[model samples]
Target: TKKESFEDVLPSILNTITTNSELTEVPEVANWLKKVLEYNLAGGKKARGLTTLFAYEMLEKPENITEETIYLAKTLGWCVEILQGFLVMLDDIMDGSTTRRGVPCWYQLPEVGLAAVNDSSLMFSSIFYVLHAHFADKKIYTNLVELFNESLMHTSIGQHLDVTMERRQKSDYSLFTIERYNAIVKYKTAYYTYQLPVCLGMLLANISDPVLHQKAEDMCLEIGKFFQIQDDYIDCYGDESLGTDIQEAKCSWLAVMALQRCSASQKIVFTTCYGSKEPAHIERIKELYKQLQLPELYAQEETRMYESLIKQAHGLPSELSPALFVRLIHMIYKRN
Candidate 1:
């Protein structure tokens, strides 16, 4: 049921930019706006949107979904979509990514270079626009705005740390320890992806129980971290067509995995070749990944931990829908 609802609303979430702008008169900007929105909104495993639905189902398991409730859920889910659009637009620029989800990154398209930064800012602005348009007069409007703002701030801070990590010198590899990685992922990726959506759902339900919210947040954040680590692993090990993040040599899962798995001699190889723009270096890293059997180990661990955590999450009080938890788990594990 949750899956069916999620499917029904996903397109509306993706089309929010086009849908909202249809009422405006700016035809010149409309095409680029739609392109930018599609580039950012269409890609990446749809984890954040599902999390929002999960939280909503947890708070209120309405057997018969109402028009008002669906409208509210779509609005909240689109916020996640908007936040992601903002981040990825900047990310494409930062990584110089030419293609995403088998299409051109908005920033890399002809006539759109660097202008994407402004577009990203606009996407950021759209989150509030959609929120205000739909929920401005609602009792929970202020709380929703605060929660969204807080999530964006945390994610930006995490992005700052990530950029800093990539720019660190060879001698500073030790500084990029797991703890720092955890912090980056937790704030930058996990909080917004897992915590924010679910929390927004709770807020919508007028459920103000801090303790329950924190419990859900903690559980989902762990799941988000596992998802990120898997993403990193997949970058180096998965099919190239399926793994753009690895192909670009950005600060990614493989770099960290190689760092952790490399021996003293291998570490020397890594230091020399890691993040080098050379194809040879990237190949060597892949070879080392195979030698270390890192991908298999990582996948096995992720599967085991995810299963364990899902069981724990499902055991939470019936007030939190088990069906929602299952849907969230299905979305993540089923992602390519």
Candidate 2:
């Protein structure tokens, strides 16, 4: 049972798109497609994609994991990776983001611009083609087909909600309520990021029990919530130049918590400054966070979420390994 490397697995995915018969007839388009895939898909940590392999390894007997199974697992993992790159490509365009994963977003390149929209569409459609090519003959083909589509749909819905939240009237935090925050986080970040990988792994291992599926979904959503909250934290308290939450008017967890805790006078100041792009307005909001002791509260919530997640992991059925969930929790629990 040899472990798969990204280098080994990625060429097969690239071939699925670049080597298509139709593409061969159009070298200009085919060459562009190759650059898009290489530029967009190669840089990520691959944690979400690899989770599919890890979960499958945990589910099935070690001796039974053939090279074919490893390849299949890595392939499905790339599908998730492809969709993530697809989502972010469009997300950067919509969010008007500049850099991603430490470079200019694909859409931000001088020659790319709005053409990246069609390219993102291509990226999304390519996932289906990859799935069809690899798993079409397998007994679980339909299941894999349905799983990717459903997860993609949920993520799109979440993205819409997020866009709506961002585009609200200037300085409006009405949509910043914790309730809405939870809904957006669950739909946008949870299903695709956490649930999709675990479920994909389960499907690959042929674990068809609905009970297990439901359990995994519930646990994964919790993990997703924690992950997004941590992200929200990083956006505010970490690098000054890297974050767009204040400028983008995102309905971040920090905004939600500050809304909940602010005094009436503080609320007046917060609503006026919360979503503004002016450095002074952003500074006022940041100062208010200190006045409201948001950093300490975030620490407390971090601990609470970690313990709660660990408790949920311990309660999983014996057939599934708690260690898998625990390991995932550790992956993001206190990540910098």
Candidate 3:
């Protein structure tokens, strides 16, 4: 059951990697591996991790969920967690973020430093190792393997596009288009975060209908965009107090719309404040957000997207149950 799988997987997953590694027989080595795995993989809310199981559950009935099915679901769930940890570990380093999931990032630790980069790679590779260990004997193994590879490729390309978006926004704020923003979310987030898990669960059940996969992709792509838009809104408007979105000069949909709608001199406000880390610079941008009525605009756009997503979920194939996906949709739907 996903219930116990959640508590046990973090401990269990490292056994594969550490047990398979060469320098892992002593307390010093054992302590190091345990610390690394626990620090990087144990803290998150497990939304993505559990989705693998929930998705598998959606594809199977209560009595149909065998021990083997539970094994597959839990293994795949941890793999998703590992991949997420892999991306987030690297992303925090790249973004110079200090903490995540209630602790210092792996790279930020005094003893870890740049070595976290190698650790991130090891975690990423562990996904394949995990799949090979657990699912290699299954008939669906090849499809599972291919799906993960494809999602990772899309994520890499999406990440590449994001950094390039940041670079362009910094070099000149003129290039931040809605098309580019949508493209960034689709590749970097949608496929991996939304579609991949659901689709993988379908593949696990031996349901490889291309039409269904495409529909799932389409639904997730929309969900991903709306999720990001909500996040972008929060960066400016929410009280999480992490306003680095402005300081980083990374383009948000808010920023994109701001550029589209600001007055000429107001545009000058953006140019001056955009790439600057100074206090007054970011404040001016926030003022522009107010002056543009972006809060209201964000609200309206969110409502529009929220409705469309519910509609999409309601339209899903009957076997998978639109009700199940709406649960996932509304999960992100209410993110503040």
Give one clash count per candidate, in the order shown.
1, 0, 0
Tens-place lDDT digits, model 1, residues 1-336: 544565566456445544654536776665666566666777565656766765775677577456787668767877887888788777667755677667777877788778878888877776776787678788989988888888778988988887777665644577557778888899888888777887888777777777777677877787778778877766666665545443444556566666777789988876676656667667777788788787688768878977887887778766655666666666667445
Give the per-residue lDDT of model 3 (tens digit) for 119-224.
8776677677777777778888888788778867888888788776665435477668898888888988777777777887877777777888788878878887
Better of 1 and 2 by lDDT: 2
Error of 1 at 170 (Å): 5.3
List candidate 1 stretches off by more than 4 Å: 1-47, 170-172, 240-254, 277-279
Candidate 2 to truth, TM: 0.92
Which candidate ranks first by lDDT, i.e. highest? 2
TM-score for all models, in order of appearance? 0.83, 0.92, 0.90
Q: How many steric overlaps does candidate 1 have?
A: 1
- What Cα-based lDDT does every candidate model obtain? 0.72, 0.83, 0.78
